Structure 1
Amino acid sequence: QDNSRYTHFLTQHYDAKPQGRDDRYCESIMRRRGLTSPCKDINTFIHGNKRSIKAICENKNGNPHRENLRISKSSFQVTTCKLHGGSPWPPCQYRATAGFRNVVVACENGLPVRLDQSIFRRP
């Protein structure tokens, strides 16, 4: 149930076990999560379990980062979906970059609520 900022973060940025990690996967998941109206230019999904992501908000799996962000201690499997072409309007074609990296989040009440998306602009 999507009734919190935490849960909405999961809807936007969490996919436990990605079926594949290619361009087709991106097109499909971006649509399924409601990020193709208008087409979001870049979005990153974090894989694996949820508790590893939550733990970024505490010393268990996070460190302070910049003014009030958190950076993970562990690395995460992630897939970044990059809008192909300029257009803000469907069909939204996407290119996937599968990666393994540290995640930065903004936390509220011990829960991640926002991803620093710009860190995934570069492969």
Structure 2
Amino acid sequence: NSRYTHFLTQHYDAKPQGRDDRYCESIMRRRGLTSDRCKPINTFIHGNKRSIKAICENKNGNPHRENLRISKSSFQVTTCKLHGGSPWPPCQYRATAGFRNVVVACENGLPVHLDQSIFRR
């Protein structure tokens, strides 16, 4: 799993379209990240699931800081950052497309947490 499915829901989008402002507003809504409070910042990873869960073994990951793992390979990512004063709907978002490695925490060989610090920014 429920953590892993929760991670995929919040942080995985396989084959994005556009990755502009409007991609962010729409995918943030669709995935339940603005229903009560506007989530301030969120990053989506793109490409295949198998490369992401492979960060959990030595194949595509290294130990990182305290209980984290860092990918050896780079991923296409989209950071959605809240723009405006209030945390309340309606939520307006700026997209930042990038290409770099990711930091995750793994549980029982699956990714369950994305470190957002590396995307703040």
Q: CA deviation at 1:64?
A: 0.4
Q: CA deviation at 1:59?
A: 0.4
Asked if residue 50 in structure 1 is aligned to residue 20 in structure 2, the reply is no
CA distance in 2, matches of 1:101, 1:85: 27
* Deviation by residue 1:37-82 (Cα, 9 ceiling, x = unmatched): 3x00000000000000000011010000001100000000000000
CA distance in 1, matches of 2:85, 2:108: 37
CA distance in 1, matches of 2:34, 2:100: 25
Q: Look up the match of 1:88.
A: 87
CA distance in 2, matches of 1:87, 1:58: 40
Q: CA deviation at 1:20?
A: 1.2
CA distance in 1, matches of 2:51, 2:83: 31
State how 1:23-102 maps to structure 2 within 5 Å: 23-37=21-35, 39-102=38-101
Which deviates the most, 84-93 or 69-78?
A: 84-93
* Aligned residues with identical type, % of pairs: 98
CA distance in 2, matches of 1:119, 1:87: 24
CA distance in 2, matches of 1:11, 1:119: 20
The count of residues paired between Structure 1 and Structure 2 equals: 119
Q: CA RMSD in A?
A: 0.8
Asked if residue 17 in structure 1 is aligned to residue 7 in structure 2, the reply is no
Question: Aligned to 2:113, what secondary structure does the other structure show?
Answer: strand
Q: Calculate the TM-score normalised by the size of structure 1.
A: 0.94
Q: Look up the match of 1:117.
A: 116
CA distance in 2, matches of 1:85, 1:76: 28
Unaligned stretches of 5+ residues in structure 2:
none
Unaligned stretches of 5+ residues in structure 1:
none
Q: CA deviation at 1:86?
A: 2.6
CA distance in 1, matches of 2:116, 2:86: 20
Q: CA deviation at 1:118?
A: 1.3
CA distance in 2, matches of 1:114, 1:99: 19
Question: Aligned to 1:15, what secondary structure does the other structure show?
Answer: coil
* Superposed structure 1 runs of 4+ greater than 2 Å apart: none
Q: CA deviation at 1:88?
A: 1.1
